[PDB]
Amino acid sequence: SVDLIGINVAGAEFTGGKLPGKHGTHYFFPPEGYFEYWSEQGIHTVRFPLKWERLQPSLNAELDDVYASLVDDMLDQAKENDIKVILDVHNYARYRKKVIGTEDVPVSAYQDLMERIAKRWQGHDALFAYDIMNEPYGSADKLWPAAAQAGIDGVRKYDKKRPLLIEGASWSSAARWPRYADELLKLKDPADNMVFSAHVFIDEDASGSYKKGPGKDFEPMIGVKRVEPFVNWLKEHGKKGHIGEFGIPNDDERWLDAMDKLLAYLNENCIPINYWAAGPSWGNYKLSIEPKDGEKRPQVALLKKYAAKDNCSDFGPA
Ligand SMILES: OC[C@H]1O[C@@H](O[C@H]2[C@H](O)[C@@H](O)[C@H](O)O[C@@H]2CO)[C@H](O)[C@@H](O)[C@@H]1O
């Protein structure tokens, strides 16, 4: 099913500078019992970041069985708790700091990664979709459309049914989406099941740092206004959409009001959201909705409120 309400469960992509790194020290998968809390809160879809270099420490070669087995176990526990998972290659269109499409990371190497991801997990009932790359940016922007096509071709060799979540240039900015997304119109999916996925924060520079508070003259519809360029481009071109990353601090009611207004707008257009972020090792991270003693998480009640209003059967907009 297409749930409008989902969460990011981050941690497996942490500490990108430590490769391969050590599980429990540099990166973190959900412990056993982790998904139980979110299942009882009525959350049934999870977006799960992964690091390409840990999945595949050598281009064009087999996946690392140790890290991939941690993914196996995660998907099993999601199935235990009635959760479907979006796998997210959280790599900014780069492998070991080099852009997909340059000499050292040819698009064929990216295609090989996605072939291997799809081959290993297409048979897993808990797998919902592939977010084939998180936030292309910078020098990756011009090369990203060609990379995306190779990623699509790779998955479709082994999985011809699941949705493919296609992010855009410029950190997949929702507010800036129409400036660059026309180049994504050339993408071809034999299965005709692509969904575009933009990201939005409502701080000053949309970086999600929230260095400052809402400030005076704060516009509660700011979240709606920053996703309107994305949703209107989807309507103009007859495409389907998704918001794969959005989060707010827990310390100002004005943030919550804007998140309510955003979720209402997304509901009216059948656009799913993945809140950024839950996860087992976030510590004091200001956007975390993971339960923490000496923290309250008023974003969760808002998510649950709109999960009960979800009467969409497919990705919108209409
Ligand atoms: O949006 C999350 C993403 O933002 C990056 O900051 C961008 C920002 O998105 C953009 O709106 C602004 O104009 O430029 C900055 C970059 O200088 C940030 O670098 C990422 O870590 C983050 O994932």
From TrEMBL:
What keyword terms does UniProt attach to this protein?
Glycosidase, Hydrolase
- What EC number(s) does the entry state? 3.2.1.4
Q: Does the entry annotate any disulfide bonds, and if so which pairs?
A: 270-312
Q: What name does UniProt use for this protein?
A: Endoglucanase
What is the species listed in this Swiss-Prot or TrEMBL entry? uncultured bacterium
